[PDB]
C-alpha cells in the first residue's frame, strides 16, 4: 500500500482475491525521461 | 517501522510501552496515521465490503467510517466502496515539451556558436 | 502557364533612378516604362528596361499616351546592340494600382503575348519583398460583367547573376549576416518567418472588415478557401503522432549527444597541444 | 455541422437522420465518395466513418463572426510564440 503511496510501484491489488496485478509498462522511450538524461549531460559536456 | 509500510506493528507498539505513559505522543501518532490509512484507501482497489477496510484501522461499526466515507470517496453504498480509479486526464502533452524544449533548443544554440 | 519571374537589381535600381529623374515634378507622376528581357523554360526573365514619356491628368483619368516612335527607335537600338535582348512586357511604378493599368497592357499587348507588368516600390518599407508582377486573365463568367478582366499576381523574387553579384556585393558594404551556421536560419526565417506569417494572418483580417460595414459584394469566391483553412487545420495531440514526435526527437538528441560528446575531447586534444607549447618552451627560452 | 474535433458519424446516425436502412447507407456513401462531395474513410466493424473533407458551401454574415473569432485568438498565439523567439533569440543576431 505504501509502495503505491510513495511512488515506486503503480498498479492495482485485488485485496478480495489476493493477487497483485501489474501492467507491462514498456516504451519508456517516448516518455520524457531520456531527454532529461540527455539534457543533464549535453550542457555538462559543453561545460567540460 | 513508520518508514516502511509496517502499520500493524506500529499499532502493536501503540499500547506496548514499557517506559511511561507516552499518551499525548501516541495520540498524535494516532491522528497522523489516521489520515495515512485515510490516504491509502485511495488506490485502485476493488469493492471492499463494510468489514475489511472497516477493521483496518481500529473500529467495529461507529460512524467514523461515515466520517472517512464522507470525507473522501469510496462512497457509502450497499456494502460497497466505490472505485473511481480513473487516472486518465493528465497524459498526451505535446505543448509543454514544445515550450520547455523550445527554450532548451535555443539554450543549446547559445553555447554553440556565440563566444563566451 | 507562367511559373515565376526573375528580377535583376540593375533594372530594380533602373526604375528608381527614373523616379529620381522625374521626381522634380513634385506633384504627381508615375514611372511607367517598357520591360525588356526574355523568358526561357517557362521561367520569366527581366534584364533591361527604360521608361516611356507619360503624363496623366486627375480629371477624366481614362487617357494615357506612350510615344510609340520612342518605343520603336530606342528598342531598335537595343536589338541592334543586343539581339539576345527583346521585349518581355512593361512596368509601372505601382504605389497602389492606378486605374490606367488595366488597358496599358491592352494597349501594348501587340508586342509581347504575356505583356507582363511589374509593380515596384519607391518608398521601401515592409517585412518582405516589395516587387510585384501580375498576369492578364480575362473571363466571360456567369457573374460579374460580361466583359470581365482581372489581373492575377504571379509570384515574384529577385533573381541573381554571377556577373551582377560582384557589383551588388560591392555596393552593399553595410551588413551581411553570412557564415551560415546554427544562427542564420534562426533570423532569416524563424525570427522573420513567424512575422512572415503575421502579415498573411493580418491580410484576411483586412478582408474581415466587411462584416456589416464594408464593400457590397460579400463572398462568392473568397470563402471556400477560408473554409478549407479551418478544415485543413492540422492534427491535434492525441495520436501516436505524439509518440512518434517524442520518438524522433528522442532519436535526434542521440546524434546531438554524440557530437557534443566529441567536441570536448577535441578541445582537450587542443589543450594538450598547448601544454606541450608551455612546458617545453618556458625552460628553453626563459 | 460537426466540428474539427471529431466529425466522425455513425451508420446508426445516418439511419436516424436519413431514415434509410443499414444495408443501403454504404452504397450511399460510396456514391458520395465517387462524386467527391465528401472525402473520408469508412470503417465497417465499428460502424463509423472518418469524414475528413466536405464540399465547401456558402454562408451569410453570421459565420464570419465565428471565423473572425477563431482568427482572433490565433493572432496572439503567433504573437506569443514569436515573442519567445525575439526575446530568447535576442543576442544571437543584432
User: Considering the domain boundaries, does residue C75 fall inside one?
Assistant: yes
User: Considering the domain boundaries, does residue C203 fall inside one?
Assistant: no
Question: Cell triple for residue D72?
Answer: 482572433
- Give the count of beta carbons closer than 10 Å to the beta carbon of residue C48: 19
The data reach a resolution, in angstroms, of: 4.3
Alpha-carbon dihedral sign for residues C193, C196, C200, C202: positive
- The answer to whether residues C20 and C146 belong to one domain is yes
Q: Which residues does residue C89 pair with via DSSP β-bridges, in sequence order?
A: C35, C116
* Total count of domains within chain C: 2
- The answer to whether residues C253 and C138 belong to one domain is no
In sequence order, what are the residues at sequence separation of 6 or more whose Cβ sits closer than 8 angstroms to the Cβ of residue C225?
none
3-class SS at A4? helix
Distance of CA B88 to the CA centre of its chain: 18
**In the listed set C182, C198, C213, which residue is the last one of a domain according to the structure?**
C182
- Domain of C243, in residue numbers: 223-282
C183 contact residues in B (CB cutoff 8 A): 109, 113
User: Considering the domain boundaries, does residue C29 fall inside one?
Assistant: yes
- The answer to whether residues C145 and C243 belong to one domain is no
Q: Residue A30: which of C247, C253, C261 has the nearest Cβ?
A: C247
Q: B92 to chain C: nearest residue by CA?
A: C238
In sequence order, what are the residues at sequence separation of 6 or more whose Cβ sits closer than 8 angstroms to the Cβ of residue C22?
C29, C31, C51
Q: Are the Cβ atoms of A15 and B39 closer than 8 angstroms?
A: no
User: Considering the domain boundaries, does residue C77 fall inside one?
Assistant: yes
In sequence order, what are the residues at sequence separation of 6 or more whose Cβ sits closer than 8 angstroms to the Cβ of residue C162?
none
Query: Which H or E run includes C35?
Result: strand C32-36
User: Considering the domain boundaries, does residue C210 fall inside one?
Assistant: no
Rg of the Cα atoms in chain D: 21
Residue matched to cell numbers 496485478: A21
Q: What is the DSSP string of C67-124?
A: -HHHHHHHHHHHHHH-SS--EEEEEE--SS--TTTTTHHHHSTTT-TT-B-EE--SS-
Please give the interface size between A and C, counted as residue pairs whose CB atoms are below 8 Å apart.
Answer: 32
- The answer to whether residues C100 and C25 belong to one domain is yes
Distance between CA C8 and CA C14 in Å, rounded?
A: 10
Distance between CA C89 and CA C44 in Å, rounded?
A: 11
User: Considering the domain boundaries, does residue C158 fall inside one?
Assistant: yes
Distance between CA D93 and CA D8 in Å, rounded?
A: 47
Q: A2 to chain B: nearest residue by CA?
A: B5
User: Considering the domain boundaries, does residue C23 fall inside one?
Assistant: yes
Distance between CA A12 and CA B54 in Å, rounded?
A: 20
User: Considering the domain boundaries, does residue C190 fall inside one?
Assistant: no
- The answer to whether residues C137 and C271 belong to one domain is no
- The answer to whether residues C173 and C245 belong to one domain is no
Query: Which H or E run includes A26?
Result: none
Amino acid at each position: 500500500a505504501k509502495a503505491i503511496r510513495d511512488g515506486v510501484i503503480e498498479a492495482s491489488i485485488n485485496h478480495e482475491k489476493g493477487y497483485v496485478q501489474s501492467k507491462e509498462m514498456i516504451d519508456i522511450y517516448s516518455t520524457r525521461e531520456p531527454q532529461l538524461a540527455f539534457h543533464q549531460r549535453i550542457s555538462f559536456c559543453l561545460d567540460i | 517501522y513508520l518508514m516502511e509500510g509496517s502499520y500493524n506493528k506500529v499499532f502493536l507498539a501503540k499500547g506496548n510501552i514499557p517506559a511511561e505513559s507516552y499518551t499525548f505522543f501516541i495520540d498524535i501518532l494516532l491522528d497522523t496515521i489516521r489520515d495515512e490509512i485515510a490516504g491509502c484507501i485511495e488506490k485502485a482497489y476493488e469493492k471492499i465490503l463494510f468489514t475489511e477496510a472497516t477493521r483496518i484501522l481500529f473500529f467495529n461499526t461507529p460512524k467514523k467510517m461515515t466520517d472517512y466515507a464522507k470525507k473522501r470517496g469510496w462512497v457509502l453504498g450497499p456494502n460497497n466502496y466505490y472505485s473511481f480509479a480513473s487516472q486518465q486526464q493528465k497524459p498526451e502533452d505535446t505543448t509543454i515539451p514544445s515550450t520547455e524544449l523550445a527554450k532548451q533548443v535555443i539554450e543549446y544554440a547559445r553555447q554553440l556558436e556565440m563566444i563566451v | 502557364a507562367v511559373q515565376k519571374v526573375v528580377v535583376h537589381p540593375l533594372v530594380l535600381l533602373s526604375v528608381v533612378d527614373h523616379f529620381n529623374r522625374i521626381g522634380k515634378v513634385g506633384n504627381q507622376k508615375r514611372v511607367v516604362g517598357v520591360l525588356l528581357g526574355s523568358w526561357q523554360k517557362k521561367v520569366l526573365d527581366v534584364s533591361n528596361s527604360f521608361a516611356v514619356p507619360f503624363d496623366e491628368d486627375d480629371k477624366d483619368d481614362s487617357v494615357w499616351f506612350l510615344d510609340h516612335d520612342y518605343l520603336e527607335n530606342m528598342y531598335g537600338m537595343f536589338k541592334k546592340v543586343n539581339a539576345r535582348e527583346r521585349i518581355v512586357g512593361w512596368y509601372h511604378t505601382g504605389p497602389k494600382l492606378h486605374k490606367n493599368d488595366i488597358a496599358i497592357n491592352e494597349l501594348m499587348k501587340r508586342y509581347c503575348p504575356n505583356s507582363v507588368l511589374v509593380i515596384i516600390d519607391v518608398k521601401p518599407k515592409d517585412l518582405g519583398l516589395p516587387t510585384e508582377a501580375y498576369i492578364s486573365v480575362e473571363e466571360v463568367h456567369d457573374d460579374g460583367t460580361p466583359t470581365s478582366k482581372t489581373f492575377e499576381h504571379v509570384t515574384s523574387e529577385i533573381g541573381a547573376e554571377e556577373a551582377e553579384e560582384v557589383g551588388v556585393e560591392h555596393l552593399l558594404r553595410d551588413i551581411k549576416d553570412t557564415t551560415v551556421g546554427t544562427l542564420s536560419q534562426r533570423i532569416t526565417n524563424q525570427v522573420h518567418g513567424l512575422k512572415g506569417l503575421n502579415s498573411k494572418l493580418l491580410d484576411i483580417r483586412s478582408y474581415l472588415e466587411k462584416v456589416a460595414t464594408g464593400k457590397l459584394p460579400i463572398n462568392h469566391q473568397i470563402i471556400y478557401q477560408l473554409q478549407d483553412v479551418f478544415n485543413l487545420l492540422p492534427d491535434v495531440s492525441l495520436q501516436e503522432f505524439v509518440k512518434a514526435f517524442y520518438l524522433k526527437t528522442n532519436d535526434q538528441m542521440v546524434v546531438v549527444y554524440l557530437a557534443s560528446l566529441i567536441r570536448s575531447v577535441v578541445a582537450l586534444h587542443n589543450l594538450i597541444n598547448n601544454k606541450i607549447a608551455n612546458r617545453d618552451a618556458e625552460k628553453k627560452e626563459g | 455541422t460537426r466540428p474539427a474535433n471529431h466529425r466522425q458519424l455513425t451508420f446508426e446516425e445516418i439511419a436516424k437522420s436519413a431514415k434509410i436502412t443499414v444495408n443501403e447507407v454504404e452504397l450511399l456513401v460510396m456514391k458520395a465518395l465517387s462524386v467527391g462531395l465528401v472525402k473520408g474513410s469508412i470503417d465497417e466493424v465499428d460502424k463509423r466513418v472518418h469524414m475528413t473533407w466536405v464540399q465547401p458551401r456558402v454562408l451569410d454574415l453570421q459565420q464570419i463572426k465565428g471565423m473572425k473569432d477563431r482568427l482572433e485568438f490565433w493572432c496572439t498565439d503567433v504573437k506569443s510564440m514569436e515573442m519567445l523567439v525575439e526575446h530568447q533569440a535576442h543576442d544571437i543576431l543584432t
